[model samples]
Target chain A: PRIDMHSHFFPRISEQEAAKFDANHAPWLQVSAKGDTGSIMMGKNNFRPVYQALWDPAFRIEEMDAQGVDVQVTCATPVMFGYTWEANKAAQWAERMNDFALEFAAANPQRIKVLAQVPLQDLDLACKEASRAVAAGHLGIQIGNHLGDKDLDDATLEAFLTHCANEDIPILVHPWDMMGGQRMKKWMLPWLVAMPAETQLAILSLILSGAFERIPKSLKICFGHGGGSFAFLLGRVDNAWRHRDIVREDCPRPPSEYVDRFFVDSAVFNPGALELLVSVMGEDRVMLGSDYPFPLGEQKIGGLVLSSNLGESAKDKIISGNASKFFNIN
Target chain B: PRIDMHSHFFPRISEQEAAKFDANHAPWLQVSAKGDTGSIMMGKNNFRPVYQALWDPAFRIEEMDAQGVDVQVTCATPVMFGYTWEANKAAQWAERMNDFALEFAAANPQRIKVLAQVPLQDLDLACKEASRAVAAGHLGIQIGNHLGDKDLDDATLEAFLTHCANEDIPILVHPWDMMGGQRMKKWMLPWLVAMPAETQLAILSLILSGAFERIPKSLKICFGHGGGSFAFLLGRVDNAWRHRDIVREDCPRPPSEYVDRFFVDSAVFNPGALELLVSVMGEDRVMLGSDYPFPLGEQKIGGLVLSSNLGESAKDKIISGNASKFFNIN
Candidate 1:
């Protein structure tokens, strides 16, 4: 009966890309490197399809059966796709990803839902891809943490968001190359540290850009990595926003009012996370996210659901009820 | 009326030490010249009196006034100290830092608080010095993300933590490095991206190690960088913890219980962050942290506070109330 909203699926495109970039796609850290004396290497060679069938329809069914996970919503990796790509190519990429996901969902019909990937490099193309994805029956559109160095609130993303809001297609944001270069040096740094920061960056960008204000009743956005550091930094964020007068003078709504329009996945990886997410975003806005297939995701994530001290009803909402309601899942 | 629990102060020791290191202490960025395409170059600037004041007492009053920060808790720069020195030397370093902070607090009794820094490379020395620091009126101790390559909760750290627990001193953790490198090319990425992930790694290690479960309630540990991804990823942490049987048999308790014991700071740079922090950690466990002298701690950061819908009361709790209660700040 549970609906997992934040599972991921990497299409063959990435595998193909990885093959070409083997020299460049090294995972950080050797299993045997000592901490004090070892060179503290980056790029480990440990990944080997950590999760089976996350994207493969046949494999997915088998996985669901293996784990007793009945339903899944495919989530593209966060902020992995940049918004600066040329519009034409961006649109094509978005369409292809969306088509791939939707076709996968259709194949299962009752067992799977999809959050399509949207290329945001070009605003017009972004808009086109969003509309096309929604029309193709995707539940939401995925946006990366940053476009090159641009954030989610960057004006260029406005056009793409408008389309999603207009179509009532929710936005699913994930962290990607958002923390590139020097920050990732220690290997697991970005995956461990940068991923959440990427989520924090996207959330702040969305709220500050007044995009939430503009789309107030229209778009419903969900943040990945459990909305990252924002959940723990709320008091600071709110205090700064209302007391400091930092927002653009022209932006009309108060920040809190705008935040209500968004949603958060429970991909957070811990239990106190549920208590915190519910307390801040309210029971209604929280949903379940498995973050499937990533090394970060493992078999016992579901157990966190059963053991939390949160009220049973609230747990239900986060576990399956909220996601189902958000997507109108049966 | 406000207390900031998570901030840093660096003091100038002597010109001899400063002259020994190059820009950024060491080659923070070791990129090839060929990779330098359109890279925004980062250069080190001289330490203002505020940054160099961590080791001195005279600069405390002036820096506090200029920054309008009421209290200063001096911690060593993450990269500057590790327990690499032999036990006696490491104990001496810890004693030096503790004595320095204690002296400042004695001079400016009401204005300075000391969070002792432990030389974690040697756990026995760490415990011995921590006991001395606590006896000397230090509030807590700061430990780096990883001890050598093993984590904060490794057997060595666990042994030390057991001692810290007995002495009733909390540990304040900050990150020196993280798991990402390729993602942090930009100058801002170090703090923005790397810091958070580092926080997550240490916290995860603590949870996985059963340190929280093994420790007593007497400890009042605080995590810097707003618990990094901990607050946002509690669900995932809990998920993993709850599934201990399936994930790791050695895991002793659900992650949520452990996460509840830690306090998160309001160092996140924006209002959206405040909202999320409140949501994840709850208002009671939250405190103010300025990571002073860092860009996120600038006085202008108040703008982030002004944007939230949190009422005056909640805002008050976060900005000052929570901190005062946590630290017994008058």
Candidate 2:
């Protein structure tokens, strides 16, 4: 019984109706004439293409079963986060997406769990919407790795984060609107290089910016992509924390001290990488992740964990046990 | 007997003479009144401060011996690279730095070895100076991770890299002029975070841009700071290479195949980091590095190596054996 801790779902949008509501560069999905595939448009400019599995839950469930994934904790795609949109429209989209995710997961309770989306641009509205969505049966919440240029530790986000913590809402942070814009544009560098950099930066910010000190200890946040190069670079971050005041300014504790503070997925794709992630994050904090339907994801689901040299207990924990505990799922 | 491979040495600059020669925004070292420390001035603006050990080889030798360091392959601080200077001035500085480094190393032949500085911004002059400097007893050449915005895999650099290989010159790459400006200015993120990102990007550029295929396999290159974050994130790179044609458009092989082509230092600052580095690079390619005379360096040379859980043979290889073989030392 393996649980895929990281996966995505998208709600279909009527092309003309979506554009009528969208402003400047807001995103809308355009379905194909045959209704088998779709394309994403961002303010008249075309973005990445989409496949049926991105929107078709029937196909997604079949594919998930084929990979032997017993459960998938799904969320609206990070691209649809609408962090840059107006709060009113953003909140509407967040509600719509949250409803769609919850409704879709309802059909298969044993195999599907869902997280909510909040407009995060407006902290008050974000908290209000998050409060409403979680109460409406959304299992948890999904947010982008950053809100605009600010890391997770920005002073402004503390209130919203504290709101989630007080509510005991779990967070799944996925990378979006990546850094290293122009330099990393070639060969999808944004998705490949900058994504990891952003996640790593966000994790460092929480550790170095005193967010851990101010935020509740029970903030259940899990970063995608095995905490996005963080576990591998903990030693470097710890060394900097040990030697430099600048790196330790907002944060008094060494980064290694916070290793137990958060969770990481086991989507590293290599046996050695999985081992390294587990070694740093520990079995309890490491969970299985399959970025299903995305070409960048592990298509074989638990392939890496199955092939790794880890012991049965550790492998079982990685494949499903840890995820069950972390997500508080059966 | 430990060999420190990633140390830096600075040539003395008379304050007035350096100011007289410097141009608009060009860098120069301004010594303090007491001469114990100095400020790095760039175009009439304060850059960073420096210590006497940077330019004082006599004190450097004692410090090295105190740490049980027998040999140090010292190069001028990457700040002195002068890659942005006018070619004639850059060439002049390179020659002077080369001569001074050689002179300093000559004072303690057994304990000190030197690498030459080249004006990497100018290809012809760079090649000519590299030819001259290596002939003038510089053990190898030191280059910044990138020249301006161009990575090591840039077409302009292929000729120079091929030149080094044809002459059997070992190349060392250290990061300078970091990316993520303005944002990373705080916490010295340029040195701590941006540097590793730059090195990792350089390695990926060389990898994905087909530099590995074009450059001779014998073109020996070593990246400072343990090749930055490359080995740790190789699985991610390989995954992208596997699925995306954009990533593999230029390079046909997986990122893992090129792991054996380069060397990485053991200055990773942790046992696990060193273990991971060695696991990816193999014993032959993992060399001892201290980043000596710098706060970022391992103060107790071979501290992590000695404390590492690796077997004695692996530890011996890391402490000195690998460096000797890689640098062609007797």
Candidate 3:
């Protein structure tokens, strides 16, 4: 009865698909596996094994068992967003990824839940894919903070949000821009710095674009890296809402009002941080995420839940209850 | 009386000071105001009139009158920590800065409180200066997250923490590194990425160093940027504690235990973030801080406090009550 709301999966793709690249049209599907028999990998220059250990479903399932997690929600890692990809190529790759994810997750109905991936370049197709994935019982969709330079609330994305709202499906967004691109450093910057920054951008874009006000309930958008810096910078955004003349012109309510609608996971790399996240966002708005198979991932749910000074009710909510409520899982 | 535990002040040093270093010596301080004239500025850079408008007793009173802040607990701007000076020279500057801050806050006892600066490079000097500053009526000392790569809990910083404990003084940490280096791009990297990441590392290092355990009653640390990723990552820290073998051989206890001893300022830029911070740390553990004079500073407070979803008691606690109690300020 436990769930991991934030986890990543890299599916097997043909070598030919990854090697071929078009200079006129940068490919978004150039994901490869590096190291030990080649793990799932993505991005242009730097290729790392999706995880040295994620070679088989049995190994992944064993990790879940060792961690005492029952169901896991999976998405492509941040590199899947392809910051340098051509727009049309981005959209095309997104469709292929979602279909692949749907097929994979469907194989293990009880153990896997997935957020649909979309070709953010084409919001209409993204919307179609969202509906298709939801029909296949996926809980939601996956989005990076930006589709190339366009943010989550871009005009193209509006139609997708509308479709997700109509379908009552939520989206789980992992950072692409903030955690990758220029921010990611050689050793740890990608995980430590860029992840949270990107998540913050995604969350801010959602708020600033008036998507929270417009859709209100389209998707309860869950963020990876435990909501990145959003939970920390929430007040700063409120400051901007108050001080920035432009913000006042667009938004009717104070910026803080929309906070409860979004959800955060426990993928952040520490326990005291979890205590603060639960304390600030409330158990209702936070869920269980482990960022599994990556070095930054967490495997021990009981220890983390127990370490927090959070009340028993709150701890239970964070451990399994919130995820159950968020995705309406049994 | 309400107090801002996270306010910053950047003293305008002489033009001669600006010309003393190459860029890598402290890249952020190399800001150009070559043509600007200012009656007051913070360091060689941070050339804003915010000091005159925000910190001077008369102006502060006026601002507090409008914002409802009663007492502002001002700290030296973070640039004070970026010097790569040899330990002795750095300590000398730190001594002078502490004297300036202590005297500055004493000038307006009713409206201002002080968190003096210390030479982070030399722990003994830092401790000695902290004791002197506390005796001079400063409530705490301001610290940048990294002391040239040595963190708050570095074996090197032990004496300093011990000294603060004996003096019953707190340490208020500001962001320094923001997780920069090889991974970051030029413009988008520093402001967008570094600050939060550095803060997270400092907080994590403190926990890992067992500084809180060693001096449980001696130190209380408050973080700028709503403790950055710590609030969101507490759960993950706990997970790490449980799975300590995965991260390091040194950690013994769970990370959340040490976090309870720390404090946080509501410098988070928005309400949802503030709410999330409160969720993790609780109102009793939180305080208000504006990080004034920085480009990212929050210009207003009363509106920001009122806009939060926090209860009256909690908001009051954050506004001033928790800080006053922690610092024993009258």
Candidate 4:
């Protein structure tokens, strides 16, 4: 059985509520029905074409089964992060969204697990929501790469991160409101280039800014899209740290020293790519990730592992074992 | 014996010329004598505190011999690239610098080779100078990561890269005027965090923007600092390419497919880092690079390769054999 740590879901929003929210809320989810399927509109763009599977546990489980996914630890799509909104309103939406995800997981506890969304723009509210989510059956909290223009390593978010570390709950770092999107409007360049670049900036900021040093060892943080580009760029960071005084003064340690501190996913497609990631991050730190219900995710979840020349034990660790340990699944 | 590809040189400038340039030029080298040694000042900083070693071939050769280096392919110090000047002045400086480097190599043909600095801000002048440099016995051409804000993949520089390709000479891509430097003023953060990021951006721009697609197979381009983060982050680029339509449309191929198209160096300090670079770039593409005369460069040039756990053949290739092939050295 394979456990996928990265997946997405859309909560059941009634037409009346969606319409009211669309008009009133800053980043409203405008859902339009089309037969048994539907489309989600954020701003002026269709975020994704969805079906009953987006909200129905039975439909999600059936698709998971077909894809050979035993369990999918799901979070809200990045479009729903609401990071650009006012802190109070964002907090309200996060609570509602968190409750919705919890309810979905509650219906199919064995096959589905949930990670909560938080309004990270406000640390107090974020910490409160994170604590509330954990108490109400959510496994972890999901946050965007940045809060407005501030990076994850900003001094303001330290308290929230400290809270998560102290509470020993996992934090899932994902990317939204990607950088350089304004200049890259054509060809989906925002999602393609800026997304990865944004994710990398988050990971690097957390490392280089000495944010990791302040966070407690129990902070079980995992980054989506295989920790962005951090694993591969680590050597360069290490080089910089060794060669420059500013880097040493800021971090007081080489960047590579912190590699074993976090978790990454196996969402990257190629077998060789997976092998390199395992080599750098270690097999135990990597879990299956499919970005489910999205076209960009793995079509055949676990297909890369199944076809790889790695040993069975390595495959087991990547496919299911790591996720089981990370999510504390029985 | 090892061949060091990342070494640098500065040409002799008279006190009269230095004073005139300092007063007239935007980025003139202000030289101040400190006993027998001198310091090259730029703005409020000492660009390099140096002795005759910076300009004297005999001094450079003696240092190379002491470092166990057989040959040094020197380029103008990154500070001397003068990329921000007007196109005409930039071209003039480039020509003068190119002739100075060519003269240095000519005086000691066996032990010293040179890469010309080109006025990358102007493509027509850049191409003309590159042609002149290669014909004048400079082994390759050196350029900054970007021309002003224009990245390596910018359409304006395509003609220059194409010219280098057609001429069958190598291009050495180095970093100057690092990004985000204004915010990173203290802690040498610019060199530590921004320089590697700058080099990675250059390499990625070349890969993602289809510059490599247009360049001929004969184009031999090498990036400093282990291709910045390119080798490590390539898996993510490939992953993004597979998952995103924009990336696919832009490159029309998996990013990893172009891995062997260029070359990198072993300037990254750790043995494991070097191993990963070799694994990703192949042994032949990895060569010894010591950013010589700078405190940040390798202290004992070939020490890393000599002490590494790699096989004899791999060590041989990295130490000298690869540089021999890359630079057409005997």
Q: Model 2 in CAPRI terms: which quality? A: medium
lDDT digits (tens) for residues A271-291 of candidate 3: 555665676677788787777
Residue-wise C-alpha lDDT for candidate 1, range A1-330, written one tens digit per residue? 777787876443433433332333422222222211111111334433333354457777777778777788886644224344455655655666676677777768688888777667766667777777767777777777676667766677766666777777788777777454432333244455557778876776666556676654767778876687666665445544553343434345554555577788866655555566667788778887777765567565466666878888878888788787678678
Against the native chain B, what TM-score does each candidate's chain B reach?
0.79, 0.95, 0.84, 0.93
Writing each residue's lDDT as its tens digit, candidate 4 over B129-199 gives 88888888898898887776677777887677888888888988887776542244444545544566667
Off by over 4 Å in 4: A11-40, A46-57, A179-201, A207-209, A250-254, A306-314, B10-25, B28-40, B45-58, B103-109, B176-213, B239-245, B250-253, B308-311
Query: Model 2, A1-330: lDDT tens per residue?
Result: 889889887776655656655745666777788977887777677777888888877778888878888888898888788888888988888888888887788778678888899999998889999889878877788889887667787777777788888899888888887766457647666666667777787788788877888899988889998877677777877777777777888777777898888888888877887888888888888888888778888778899998888889999998989888767888
Candidate of highest DockQ: 2
Top-down DockQ ranking: 2, 4, 3, 1
Q: Write the per-residue lDDT of candidate 2 for residues B75-123, one digit (tens) a residue.
A: 9888788888889988998888899898888778778999999988889
lDDT values of the candidates? 0.62, 0.81, 0.65, 0.76
Clashes of each: 91, 0, 52, 1
Q: Which sequence of candidate numbers ranks them by TM-score, best first?
A: 2, 4, 3, 1
Measured against the true chain A, the candidates' chain A TM-scores are: 0.82, 0.95, 0.85, 0.93
Q: In lDDT terms, how accurate is model 3?
A: 0.65
**Leading candidate by TM-score:** 2
